[PDB]
């Protein structure tokens, strides 16, 4: 998986044109993520390739099989100048010369990346949810006065384009999430928007499983341990599979809360539907405290254990 970075002495203009093509809905094909990575690199490392290659982001991406193939040009002022002559890029090129040049402005790259970041909290849910959420966030930050997005970015078509770009692109998601988490707390509005989005993205797609896990746990000053009902013979397989899925998730470390969004490996079975009995136990224990588990419906077959879990928690 070869990622092409574009290297010129007109990086800002090239980048803004990559944003032009992306926003136009033009399919960049196998250059998409390469283009995206260039943007990120121009933004966070000011196109210093040596500073990037030694970064945790490049570290991780290389550790995940990505190979960086830099295309040095310069004198190239135009994204069109930079695409290989190779004929499987013919339609791309054909579309790109129909591109209007919005003269490169300052902060438009950060503008773009923050916009993208607003789609993250509900990305795994779907386009409707991700986009609705994005719009509500847009109005939030707008009325904060911290940032104003162009209104034509708010049409449903354009936001479907962006949603798509995030879906297809692993690198974009990873860079935005990594920087959301690790980038400090300076004086760049876009970094704080991205940070806020990533903060709202934590455990996206994994909150039900998380809370079920929370509620089959038992606080004892002898450490902390599993619920006794969890340790019956009927629930010997659910606990096995759950422990295994949880280990797989745990592999991903600090990226574990974002593992569903980034589509990380090992998450197949981290889906509460597969664990009815543990869900029953957790909902019981939850009820006994008043609060409840959102998104968890116990079918008849496990209603008994549900009360079995319920009453016993109230007698404690």
């Amino acid at each position: 998986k070869k990622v092409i970075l574009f290297d010129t002495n007109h990086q800002v203009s090239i980048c803004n044109q990559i944003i032009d093509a992306i926003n136009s809905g033009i399919d960049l094909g196998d250059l998409l993520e390469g283009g995206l990575l260039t943007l990120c690199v121009e933004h966070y490392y000011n196109s210093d390739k040596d500073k990037f290659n030694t970064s945790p982001i490049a570290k991780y991406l290389r550790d995940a099989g990505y190979e960086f193939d830099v295309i040095k040009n310069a004198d190239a002022t135009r994204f069109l100048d930079v695409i290989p002559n190779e004929p499987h890029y013919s339609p791309l090129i054909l579309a790109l010369k129909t591109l209007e040049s919005t003269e490169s402005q300052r902060g438009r790259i950060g503008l773009f990346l923050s916009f993208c970041s607003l789609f993250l909290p509900k990305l795994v849910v779907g386009d409707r949810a991700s986009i609705e959420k994005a719009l509500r966030q847009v109005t939030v930050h707008q009325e904060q006065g911290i940032v104003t997005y162009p209104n034509h970015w708010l049409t449903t078509g354009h936001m479907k384009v962006i949603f798509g770009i995030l879906r297809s692109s692993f690198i974009l998601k990873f860079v935005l999430i990594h920087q959301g988490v690790n980038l400090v707390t300076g004086h760049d509005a876009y970094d704080s928007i991205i940070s806020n989005s990533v903060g709202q993205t934590r455990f996206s797609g994994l909150l039900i499983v998380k809370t079920v896990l929370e509620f089959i746990l038992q606080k004892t000053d002898s450490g902390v341990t599993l619920h006794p009902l969890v340790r019956t013979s009927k629930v010997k397989n659910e606990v096995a599979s759950f422990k295994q899925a949880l280990s797989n998730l745990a592999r991903h470390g600090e990226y574990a809360p974002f593992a569903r969004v980034l589509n990380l490996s090992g998450i197949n079975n981290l889906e509460h539907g597969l664990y009815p009995q543990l869900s029953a136990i957790a909902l019981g224990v939850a009820t006994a405290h008043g609060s409840t588990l959102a998104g968890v419906n116990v079918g008849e077959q496990y209603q008994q254990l549900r009360e079995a879990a319920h009453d016993a928690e109230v007698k404690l």
């Binding site: 896990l213 929370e214 902390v224 341990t225 745990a250 809360p257």
Partner: peptide, 23 residues
């Protein structure tokens, strides 16, 4: 709550799963 920290730490790998599950 507070245990929420336990579930999350189990999930991020900050808490060994063997502490809570064992063997």
């Amino acid at each position: 709550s507070y245990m929420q920290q336990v579930s999350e730490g189990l999930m991020t790998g900050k808490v060994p799963i063997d502490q809570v599950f064992g063997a």
